[PDB]
Design a protein around this ligand. Structure first.
Ligand code: NA
Length: 330
């Protein structure tokens, strides 16, 4: 089997991407944030505290003929941005892009933090990191990918995120029309439960490439590119008037600037992030200070290749017995 679903930016900045997911019988379609940095599929639901729901579409298990309470199971998760959610668990039928899993754990939120309530466009998350990170207790649950894997034509999924445009998540196949050149594969460590890999270095604009190992994770659920402070300083030093602002919470730059590209290494291959991708616009409405898309990972404890980096590439998440990541230009 295969599946193929379009993923759409939630706003004009590509802050996140939503993908429609069918849950239950008859189908209830919810728009989920597919997150390669976490391992829970959780949804706004009929159980979510009413004051914490503001425009989201909810899953109502009582209206699904295939829903069953997973008795005694609970979940609770905290993300890198300080947001959180928790609740109880149902099993149900879940389909993505025509690929169906029966018996998927659907984590029903009883509580969500303010950042979720305030984002009316995201109805929940679909985690695509390794199932070792799943938070369901006392019986840990599998991701949608892990449950689909054995049925797929190839044990893979691909992320093809758009810049200010829709893109695609495919399950079970490589679309050889979706990228240019060849795919460069690189080793993955699953020790922390992430799609963790080592970049071979970077370049700023037309500058020389610096060969240096950068360990980090491929995380579709993180907006920005978080890299070591040395690398980030070297980037922003090429933008007149850029500075790190403790008041704003990272590097800002004059909205009048033209940003340089940023290149990262994948083995001997190179992925180029155009400068435009690194512009996250005014820090507050009407400001002439703009927020940068490359930020320091210092204090986060891991480097994160978030959407800014991933949307410059066609990315293969190879879930074979020895997992690997692939990157191609597009
Ligand atoms: Na922000």
């Amino acid at each position: 089997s295969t599946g193929s679903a379009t993923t759409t930016p939630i706003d004009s900045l590509d802050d996140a991407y939503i993908t429609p997911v069918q849950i239950g019988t008859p189908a209830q379609t919810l728009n989920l944030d597919f997150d390669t940095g976490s391992s829970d599929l959780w949804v706004f639901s009929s159980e979510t505290t009413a004051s914490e729901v503001d425009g989201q579409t909810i899953y109502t298990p009582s209206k699904s003929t295939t829903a069953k309470l997973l008795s005694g199971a609970t979940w609770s998760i905290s993300y890198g941005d300080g947001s959180s959610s928790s609740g109880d668990v149902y099993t149900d039928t879940v389909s993505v892009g025509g690929l169906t899993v029966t018996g998927q754990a659907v984590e029903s939120a009883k509580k969500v933090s303010s950042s979720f309530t305030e984002d009316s466009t995201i109805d929940g998350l679909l985690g695509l990191a390794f199932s070792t990170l799943n938070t369901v207790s006392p019986t840990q649950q599998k991701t949608f990918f892990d449950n689909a894997k054995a049925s797929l034509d190839s044990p893979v999924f691909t992320a093809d995120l758009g810049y200010h445009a829709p893109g695609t998540y495919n399950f079970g196949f490589i679309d050889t029309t979706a990228y240019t050149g060849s795919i460069t594969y690189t080793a993955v460590s699953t020790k922390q439960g992430f799609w963790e890999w080592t970049s071979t270095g970077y370049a700023v604009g037309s500058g020389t490439f610096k060969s240096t190992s950068i360990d980090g994770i491929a995380d579709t659920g993180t907006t920005l590119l978080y890299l070591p402070a040395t690398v980030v300083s070297a980037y922003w030093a090429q933008v007149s008037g850029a500075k790190s602002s403790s008041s704003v919470g990272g590097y800002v730059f004059p909205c009048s600037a033209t940003l340089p590209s940023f290149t990262f290494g994948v083995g001997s291959a190179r992925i180029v992030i155009p400068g435009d991708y690194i512009d996250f616009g005014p820090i507050s409405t009407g400001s002439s200070s703009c927020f940068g898309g490359i930020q320091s990972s210092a204090g986060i404890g891991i480097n994160i290749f978030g959407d800014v980096a991933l949307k410059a590439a066609f990315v293969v998440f190879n879930g074979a017995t020895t997992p690997t990541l692939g990157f191609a230009s597009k």
